[PDB]
Write an enzyme that holds these catalytic residues in place. Structure first.
Site, PDB file in Angstrom:
ATOM      1  N   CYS A 109       2.594   7.631  -4.147  1.00  0.00           N
ATOM      2  CA  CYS A 109       3.863   8.084  -3.588  1.00  0.00           C
ATOM      3  C   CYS A 109       4.906   6.970  -3.424  1.00  0.00           C
ATOM      4  CB  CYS A 109       3.312   8.484  -2.184  1.00  0.00           C
ATOM      5  SG  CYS A 109       4.690   9.229  -1.215  1.00  0.00           S
ATOM      6  N   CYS A 188      -2.944  16.904  -7.802  1.00  0.00           N
ATOM      7  CA  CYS A 188      -2.687  16.107  -8.855  1.00  0.00           C
ATOM      8  C   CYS A 188      -4.009  15.550  -9.472  1.00  0.00           C
ATOM      9  CB  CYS A 188      -1.884  15.232  -8.602  1.00  0.00           C
ATOM     10  SG  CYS A 188       0.016  15.590  -8.159  1.00  0.00           S
TER      11      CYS A 188
HETATM   12  N1  LIG Z   1       9.035   8.652   6.113  1.00  0.00           N
HETATM   13  C1  LIG Z   1       9.642   9.310   5.269  1.00  0.00           C
HETATM   14  O1  LIG Z   1      10.237  10.362   5.553  1.00  0.00           O
HETATM   15  C2  LIG Z   1       9.405   9.121   4.006  1.00  0.00           C
HETATM   16  C3  LIG Z   1      10.061   9.761   2.827  1.00  0.00           C
HETATM   17  C4  LIG Z   1       9.830   9.644   1.365  1.00  0.00           C
HETATM   18  C5  LIG Z   1       8.826   8.462   1.114  1.00  0.00           C
HETATM   19  N2  LIG Z   1       8.293   7.827   2.214  1.00  0.00           N
HETATM   20  C6  LIG Z   1       7.378   6.810   1.714  1.00  0.00           C
HETATM   21  O2  LIG Z   1       5.974   7.542   1.399  1.00  0.00           O
HETATM   22  C7  LIG Z   1       5.111   6.665   1.607  1.00  0.00           C
HETATM   23  C8  LIG Z   1       3.957   7.151   2.638  1.00  0.00           C
HETATM   24  O3  LIG Z   1       4.552   7.116   4.034  1.00  0.00           O
HETATM   25  P1  LIG Z   1       3.949   7.309   5.246  1.00  0.00           P
HETATM   26  O4  LIG Z   1       4.740   7.295   6.310  1.00  0.00           O
HETATM   27  O5  LIG Z   1       2.703   8.102   5.003  1.00  0.00           O
HETATM   28  O6  LIG Z   1       3.237   5.720   5.418  1.00  0.00           O
HETATM   29  P2  LIG Z   1       3.102   5.003   6.727  1.00  0.00           P
HETATM   30  O7  LIG Z   1       2.979   5.660   7.651  1.00  0.00           O
HETATM   31  O8  LIG Z   1       4.003   3.576   6.377  1.00  0.00           O
HETATM   32  O9  LIG Z   1       1.517   4.049   6.491  1.00  0.00           O
HETATM   33  C9  LIG Z   1       1.693   2.747   5.459  1.00  0.00           C
HETATM   34  C10 LIG Z   1       0.109   2.948   5.322  1.00  0.00           C
HETATM   35  O10 LIG Z   1      -0.066   1.581   4.372  1.00  0.00           O
HETATM   36  C11 LIG Z   1      -1.010   0.760   4.751  1.00  0.00           C
HETATM   37  N3  LIG Z   1      -0.771  -0.505   4.574  1.00  0.00           N
HETATM   38  C12 LIG Z   1       0.349  -1.442   4.565  1.00  0.00           C
HETATM   39  N4  LIG Z   1       0.381  -2.753   4.294  1.00  0.00           N
HETATM   40  C13 LIG Z   1      -0.982  -2.660   3.895  1.00  0.00           C
HETATM   41  C14 LIG Z   1      -1.979  -3.792   3.425  1.00  0.00           C
HETATM   42  N5  LIG Z   1      -1.365  -4.903   3.110  1.00  0.00           N
HETATM   43  N6  LIG Z   1      -3.026  -3.683   2.963  1.00  0.00           N
HETATM   44  C15 LIG Z   1      -3.717  -2.196   3.012  1.00  0.00           C
HETATM   45  N7  LIG Z   1      -2.978  -1.133   3.517  1.00  0.00           N
HETATM   46  C16 LIG Z   1      -1.814  -1.475   4.072  1.00  0.00           C
HETATM   47  C17 LIG Z   1      -0.872   1.126   6.339  1.00  0.00           C
HETATM   48  O11 LIG Z   1      -2.006   0.389   7.009  1.00  0.00           O
HETATM   49  P3  LIG Z   1      -2.073   0.186   8.508  1.00  0.00           P
HETATM   50  O12 LIG Z   1      -2.477   1.479   9.336  1.00  0.00           O
HETATM   51  O13 LIG Z   1      -3.448  -0.886   8.713  1.00  0.00           O
HETATM   52  O14 LIG Z   1      -0.825  -0.170   9.045  1.00  0.00           O
HETATM   53  C18 LIG Z   1      -0.760   2.441   6.390  1.00  0.00           C
HETATM   54  O15 LIG Z   1      -1.997   3.288   6.182  1.00  0.00           O
HETATM   55  C19 LIG Z   1       5.782   5.295   2.010  1.00  0.00           C
HETATM   56  O16 LIG Z   1       5.769   4.260   1.064  1.00  0.00           O
HETATM   57  C20 LIG Z   1       7.101   5.327   2.471  1.00  0.00           C
HETATM   58  O17 LIG Z   1       7.913   4.592   2.434  1.00  0.00           O
HETATM   59  C21 LIG Z   1       8.559   8.039   3.357  1.00  0.00           C
END
Ligand SMILES: NC(=O)c1ccc[n+]([C@@H]2O[C@H](COP(=O)([O-])OP(=O)(O)OC[C@H]3O[C@@H](n4cnc5c(N)ncnc54)[C@H](OP(=O)(O)O)[C@@H]3O)[C@@H](O)[C@H]2O)c1
Ligand SMILES: C=CC1=C(C)/C(=C/c2[nH]c(/C=C3N=C(/C=C4\NC(=O)C(C)=C4C=C)C(C)=C\3CCC(=O)O)c(CCC(=O)O)c2C)NC1=O
Length: 205
Positions: A109, A188
């Protein structure tokens, strides 16, 4: 031979948690890499294997990818919008671990900004977008079977399984529920029709 064993990166995030729950409920043998196991829930479906560590540590990633059939990537930065290389450096480690272990399918993603006109990225999201682009490059150039998932706004609407997937960032809305996004990541795993493509899931709720 279908996919049975998967690794999920980012399983404790908003989309990761529901992707993990759905994957286990669907019958997958799931391994997760987490920095802090307290962020995994006790109720509901549970992963088969938990590796404690960091996606920036090659050895931790290698331990997570070993023996898998496919990898799901839902890494992100939570509410941190500062300049970053966490996702792309993580992806570099995942690619290296996949190649070391014979794993050839990754579903990852980034965001619909990588499909839309780049002059439309809100300034505050540009740094994270720049690292999404680095991550996409890493995955595209890896020579692995890579499905690029580029969602719009991720919401909290229910699971429907009824969303639309386009290849160009146009679609019925600019929102996808986190549950539907996870459902699509799992879809997928059972088709090759999106390998090498960028995909845009969206739905009118
Ligand atoms: N929010 C929106 O509307 C939106 C829209 C389009 C795309 N996105 C993108 O979609 C993707 C998924 O977003 P989400 O909101 O589901 O994600 P999220 O809530 O930001 O969660 C990030 C995940 O990555 C893990 N992580 C970060 N650094 C890490 C590290 N060094 N080692 C291991 N794991 C690590 C976090 O772990 P911890 O639990 O340990 O913190 C968490 O499990 C992201 O890239 C975001 O930018 C978001
Ligand atoms: C804390 C930061 C943050 C906030 C508060 C935020 C709000 C926000 N995100 C939106 C959608 C969106 N938000 C994203 C993407 C992201 N959203 C993310 O938080 C991250 C990290 C990404 C990934 C770069 C996308 C792709 C859309 C498309 C929604 C649409 O087209 O209307 C919308 C709908 C239209 C609008 O911008 O007015 C808002 C208000 N976006 C943010 O980034």
């Amino acid at each position: 031979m279908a996919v049975k064993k998967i690794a999920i990166f980012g399983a404790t995030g908003q989309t990761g948690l529901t992707t993990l729950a759905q994957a286990v409920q669907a019958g997958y043998e799931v391994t997760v890499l987490v920095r802090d196991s307290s962020r995994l829930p006790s109720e509901g479906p549970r992963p088969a294997h938990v590796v404690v560590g960091d996606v920036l540590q090659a050895a931790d990633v290698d331990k997570t990818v070993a023996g898998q059939d496919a990898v799901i990537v839902l890494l992100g930065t939570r509410n941190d919008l500062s300049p970053t290389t966490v996702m792309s450096e993580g992806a570099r480690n995942i690619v290296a671990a996949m190649k070391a272990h014979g794993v050839d399918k990754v579903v990852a993603c980034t965001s619909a900004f990588l499909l839309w006109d780049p002059t439309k990225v809100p300034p505050r999201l540009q740094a994270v977008t720049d690292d999404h682009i680095r991550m996409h490059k890493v995955l595209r150039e890896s020579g692995l079977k890579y499905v690029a998932v580029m969602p719009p706004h991720i919401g909290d609407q229910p699971l429907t399984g009824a969303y639309t997937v386009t290849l160009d960032g146009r679609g019925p809305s600019r929102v996808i529920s986190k549950h539907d996004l996870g459902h699509f990541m799992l879809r997928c795993l059972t088709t090759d029709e999106y390998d090498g493509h960028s995909t845009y899931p969206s739905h009118q709720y």
